[PDB]
Design a protein around this ligand. Structure first.
Ligand SMILES: NC(=O)c1ccc[n+]([C@@H]2O[C@H](COP(=O)([O-])OP(=O)(O)OC[C@H]3O[C@@H](n4cnc5c(N)ncnc54)[C@H](OP(=O)(O)O)[C@@H]3O)[C@@H](O)[C@H]2O)c1
Ligand code: SF4
Ligand code: SF4
Ligand code: SF4
Lengths: 147, 64, 43, 138, 296, 88, 176, 88, 53
């Protein structure tokens, strides 16, 4: 009914308000990830905190290059994450390998290991474009959890 | 500016302000004089014991 | 034409330190305040 | 000094609407601030900027309620701002519909589309391959 | 008896609204801004975190050792709320025969909350990391016991109601001048993150943030008070809320400004630096009511 | 209070002199749209006559001579004296 | 020119020793550390509200790939494959064909965003100035198929950004 | 009642645990010396507990000689601790 | 850079400070705590991008 449909909006709004990330470094992207903390392009203005908390965290942001050595390392982390989880591929390396696509040691863009929900395209993903890793994600939460 | 920070303090100026007021205003309903006595030592308890013996049999705090 | 004009006046810190003593240095003065606060406290 | 700052806040609430005006701005936008308006935009976007305020002050580009058919009142992102972002919002100095207009080409679209997402009318790839033909007929 | 329910639900709201003030004050200390997208000034986020963390967020069990993992939050949340009972807010909820003895004991019993959570995980790396965090909490309770026993030795018995009467015109900050600096550091003991950092994650720190307010009010009675005024309980409570929250900002100040001490050097702060200072003051506070007459 | 007059006294009092040079510091002398269209200058080329690549060799002398199969590699690196602006 | 770091024990006797001993008995440097953070709180936060305020940018900025065209219609790109060879990621794929009417133009033109490190060589190696990098960020997708740009079909949709492109290129000729 | 105050806190604490679980649907011997020192100091604090409690009535010349004496041996124990304590 | 007559450089190597600083950690960590190691990496500034060659 109408009461159930409005209640499902409140559950969706709980995630739309606050998202606590486990941001993976291991990239040149990691500096642009740290530019979220930088006051000019504020992200703590949202319900997002740089406390990380690896076991507690909801939305793991995979920034940049994933090598074959780090390929089983990121997968075991994703399994330890709670069930409402999203993956943001940050940078061209995390998408499909910007550079190093034809290299032997680099996995061809995250999806072969861990499923990606929102793609952030830019090498140096500008803090302008990176705020589509939060706001567009928040926009995409409709879910339509009926039953 | 402080039109954002101080509302975060003003909301604490209500919720943390409750336990101080709730413990004080409750003595209006429990007593006809807004006071509850604590024994600490057996002498003040005996005074409370004879106060229940005089006039009001059930009530602890009563005049005369 | 693209050119650069030098606006030099206050260049910045050329091995310069702004670390200056503030609100009165201790030595013997703040101890006199410290023990003085105790003596005024006990009395 | 404190009375002058309090009077500036009361005048700011009186400027943008009032009791219903400032409350609508506080809920939809992050912060409410008064300034000079540019006005002119396809699908009624406010874009009230020009104020000195602080660093990078091309302030308050308020999004239009239902630009194409999204009903953006409670939720709105940077999907708006039709070809004016380079001047009134980011890089240039002059206002796009006031001082320096973009030159007509008769090829660019008159109505600007929203962000491509999980909704219908989304991006899809294709190939220009004509393919090597096979001949078999009775 | 509605007063107990008037000291749990609005108290848990103060813990909930702490997360905003911790994000906004530290925010303005870091030139960034606090929450704004959520509500009018981000005031709708403490309830938003409550719906997020409790309802849909599940728990993947590492081992789940039958009795534990579910017992540790009872020792966390339960013991943190019992501390609110003997507090001398105008007229306290069932005033204890000895106030501070109940205050020191239930805080020392709160050490189990981090102990049982160390037993909750099967992994050895978790428990060794847990015992290291217990070692910080266990050590600073010695100083917590000493400073209390030297403050009370100046004036008043163990009753918390007598601590208001001694501060009729003069605060206890000035006679206990080195102890005022000492007690402020020793309060950073129950995993305060400012000195050093180690069921679900949500309700576990809801007890830890509650202990921060608990020590903030405990400082506001032992060192602050100004007056009592039995005629108007309103004038005390308005004045108390300002005094308590000014100390609450200072715990958000030390966490913002200062890095971790190195665990070993934090243990070198005690025994080598703090304990020779506090015991010398404890010796000094024995002699003071004997040197000059003042044994209430 | 949000009034600048009283606040500027507080920030100047609490460790070091401030007032000038703000945290934001993008109020005045920030030129938008850069400048009117400029003309980029040409180098020692572009102007005709005596502009041969025979004179401007670039990549010509590159061939490595094979050598042989008390002498120092250079005069020894002498230490430099302490800075006149700051001794320590 | 040789600076030094160490002061080599400044304390000597009485006055220079006790004040250095003061910041260990009591704190003072903690109060001095508090002072810098106190002044930092009172000064206004330099924050930009993203959907309403925007961060400063350049006239020449690289981020979004879109191919320009002439004022009187007609596709500006020639299919030289020049931009393919310069491309360090080898992202841009190109198949060339005659358009049956004399002119030599494009058929397949895929610039995948799975690759491309947004270097802007293809912007600067194009002799006809076809690929001009549009100052855009609004292209975050759900799938790979939605992300990698197809044979001109999504790139000639960059005509919607060509009003900015024609204005921003006015800094390119006679460089900045 | 004190039991009425205690049980209401504990029952609502366990009630939150019910919400937390039911509602969702889908080595080193050096640290031992710390515990030893702690427990041994507790009892000296326990003996120094009645200080603002027994001094009200009892003789001061007899107490002061004994009251300081407990804190002296509490520091003498630490004086033995200083000579080779540990790296932690 | 090792170069031929062709436009392609056949093997170049940049030996970034990563290999230099991480070699020292065998000596830097001797007789130091776990938290001391955290201080070593930062002051040497071992950026993990340096380890490519
Ligand atoms: N090992 C065995 O259990 C076993 C033994 C013998 C035969 N089989 C056969 O092999 C198959 C194995 O499948 P399973 O039992 O593993 O599936 P399952 O786990 O029960 O999952 C069924 C999924 O299919 C969707 N679905 C099913 N019926 C639907 C309907 N009428 N309309 C819309 N969506 C529907 C459901 O999605 P929604 O929730 O969104 O509707 C659900 O997620 C069975 O069909 C069974 O006949 C299995
Ligand atoms: S996308 Fe660019 S910035 Fe990010 S890791 Fe790859 S090369 Fe580095
Ligand atoms: S984009 Fe430019 S360089 Fe590339 S094929 Fe087209 S015209 Fe040639
Ligand atoms: S910007 Fe650089 S990497 Fe991207 S398509 Fe153009 S040449 Fe290739």
């Amino acid at each position: 009914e109408y009461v159930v449909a409005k209640l499902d909006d409140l559950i969706n709004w709980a995630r739309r308000s606050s998202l606590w990330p486990m941001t993976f470094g291991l990239a040149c992207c990691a500096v642009e990830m740290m530019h979220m903390a930088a006051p000019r392009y504020d992200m703590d203005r949202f319900g997002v905190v740089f406390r990380a908390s690896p076991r507690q965290s909801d939305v793991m942001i995979v920034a940049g290059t994933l090598t074959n050595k780090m390929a089983p390392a990121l997968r075991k982390v994703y399994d330890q994450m709670p069930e409402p989880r999203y993956v943001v591929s940050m940078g061209s390396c995390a998408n499909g390998g910007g550079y190093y696509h034809y290299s032997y040691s680099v996995v061809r863009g995250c999806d072969r290991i861990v499923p990606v929900d929102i793609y952030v395209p830019g090498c140096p993903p500008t803090a302008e474009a990176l705020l589509y890793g939060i706001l567009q994600l928040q926009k995409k939460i409709k879910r339509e959890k009926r039953l | 500016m402080w039109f954002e920070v101080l509302p975060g303090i003003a909301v604490m100026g209500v919720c943390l302000f409750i336990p101080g007021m709730a413990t004080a205003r409750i003595h209006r309903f429990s007593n006809g004089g807004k006071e509850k006595r604590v024994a600490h030592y057996p002498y003040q308890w005996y005074l409370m014991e004879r106060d229940r013996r005089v006039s009001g049999v059930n009530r602890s705090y009563v005049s005369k | 034409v693209k050119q650069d004009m030098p606006p030099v006046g206050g260049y910045g810190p050329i091995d310069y330190k702004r670390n200056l003593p503030r609100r009165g240095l201790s030595g013997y003065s703040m101890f006199a305040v410290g023990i003085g606060a105790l003596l005024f406290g006990y009395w | 000094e404190l009375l002058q700052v309090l009077k500036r806040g009361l005048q700011q609430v009186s400027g943008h609407g009032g009791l219903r005006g400032y409350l609508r701005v506080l809920f939809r936008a992050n912060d409410v601030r008064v300034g000079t308006l540019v006005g002119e935009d396809k699908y009624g976007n406010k874009y009230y900027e020009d104020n000195k305020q602080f660093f990078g002050r091309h302030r308050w580009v308020i999004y239009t309620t239902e630009m194409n058919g999204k009903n953006t009142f409670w939720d709105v992102d940077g999907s708006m701002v039709p070809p004016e972002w380079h001047r009134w919002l980011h890089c240039m100095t002059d206002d796009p519909p006031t001082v320096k207009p973009p030159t007509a080409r008769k090829f660019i679209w008159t109505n600007h589309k929203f962000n491509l997402s999980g909704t219908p009318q989304q991006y899809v790839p294709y190939s220009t391959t004509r393919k090597k033909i096979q001949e078999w007929v009775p | 008896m509605i007063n107990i329910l008037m000291l749990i639900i609005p108290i848990l709201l103060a813990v909930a609204f702490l997360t905003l003030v911790e994000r906004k004050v530290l925010g303005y200390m870091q030139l960034r801004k606090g929450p704004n997208v959520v509500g009018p000034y981000g005031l709708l986020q403490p309830i938003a975190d409550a719906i997020k963390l409790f309802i849909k967020e599940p728990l993947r069990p590492a081992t789940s050792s039958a009795s534990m993992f579910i017992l540790a939050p009872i020792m966390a949340l339960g013991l943190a709320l019992t501390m609110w009972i003997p507090l001398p807010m105008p007229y306290p909820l069932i005033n204890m025969n000895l106030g501070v003895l109940f205050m020191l004991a239930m805080s020392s019993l709160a050490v189990y909350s981090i102990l049982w959570s160390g037993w909750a995980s099967n992994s050895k790396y978790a428990l060794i990391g847990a015992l290291r965090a217990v070692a910080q909490t266990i050590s600073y309770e010695v100083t917590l016991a000493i400073i209390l026993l030297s403050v009370l030795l100046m004036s008043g018995s163990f009753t918390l109601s007598t601590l208001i009467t001694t501060q009729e015109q003069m605060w206890l900050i000035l006679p206990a001048w080195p102890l005022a600096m000492m007690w402020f550091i020793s309060t950073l003991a129950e995993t305060n993150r400012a000195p050093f950092d180690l069921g679900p994650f949500a309700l576990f720190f809801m007890a830890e943030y509650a202990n921060i307010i608990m020590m903030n009010i405990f400082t506001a009675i032992l060192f602050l008070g100004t007056s009592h005024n039995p005629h108007m309980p309103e004038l005390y409570t308005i004045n108390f809320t300002i005094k308590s929250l000014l100390l609450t900002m200072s715990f958000l100040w030390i966490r913002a400004s200062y890095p971790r001490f190195r665990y070993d050097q934090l243990m070198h702060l005690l025994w080598k630096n703090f304990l020779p200072l506090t015991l010398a003051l404890c010796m000094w506070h024995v002699s003071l009511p004997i040197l000059t007459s003042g044994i209430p | 209070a949000s009034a600048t007059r009283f606040i500027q006294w507080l920030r100047n009092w609490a460790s070091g002199r401030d007032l000038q040079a703000k945290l934001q510091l993008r109020y005045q002398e920030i030129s938008k749209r850069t400048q009117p269209p400029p003309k980029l200058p040409v180098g020692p080329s572009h102007k005709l006559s005596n502009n041969y690549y025979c004179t401007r060799d670039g990549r010509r002398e590159a061939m490595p001579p094979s050598i042989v199969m008390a002498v120092s590699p250079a005069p020894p690196i002498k230490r430099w004296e302490l800075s006149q602006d700051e001794p320590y | 020119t040789y600076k030094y770091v160490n002061l080599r024990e400044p304390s000597m006797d009485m006055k220079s020793v006790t004040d250095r001993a003061a910041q260990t008995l009591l704190w003072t440097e903690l109060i001095r550390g508090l002072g810098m953070t106190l002044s930092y709180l009172f000064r206004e936060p330099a924050t930009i509200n993203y959907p309403f305020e925007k961060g400063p940018l350049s006239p020449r900025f690289r981020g979004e790939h879109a191919l320009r065209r002439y004022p009187s219609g007609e596709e500006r790109c020639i299919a030289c494959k020049l931009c393919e060879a310069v491309c360090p990621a080898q992202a841009i794929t190109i198949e060339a064909e005659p358009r049956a009417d004399g002119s030599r133009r494009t058929t397949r033109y895929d610039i995948d965003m799975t690759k491309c490190i947004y270097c802007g060589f293809c912007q600067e190696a194009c002799p006809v100035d076809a690929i001009v990098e549009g100052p855009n960020f609004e292209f975050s997708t759900e799938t790979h198929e939605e992300l990698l740009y197809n044979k001109e079909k999504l790139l000639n949709n960059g005509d919607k950004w060509e009003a900015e492109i024609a204005a921003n290129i006015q800094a390119d000729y006679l460089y900045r | 009642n004190l039991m009425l105050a205690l049980l209401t806190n504990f029952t609502l604490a366990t009630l939150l645990v019910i919400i937390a679980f039911w509602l969702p649907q889908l080595f080193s011997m050096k640290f031992f010396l710390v515990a030893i020192t702690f427990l041994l100091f507790d009892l000296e604090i326990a003996l120094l507990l009645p200080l603002p409690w027994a001094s009200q009535t009892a003789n001061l010349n007899t107490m002061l000689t004994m009251a300081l004496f407990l804190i002296i041996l509490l520091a003498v124990s630490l004086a033995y601790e200083w000579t080779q304590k540990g790296l932690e | 850079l090792v170069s031929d007559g062709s436009s392609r450089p056949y093997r170049c190597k940049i030996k970034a400070p990563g290999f230099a600083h991480l070699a020292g950690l065998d000596k830097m960590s001797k007789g130091h705590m776990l938290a001391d190691v955290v201080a070593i990496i930062g002051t040497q500034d071992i950026v993990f991008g340096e380890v490519d060659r």
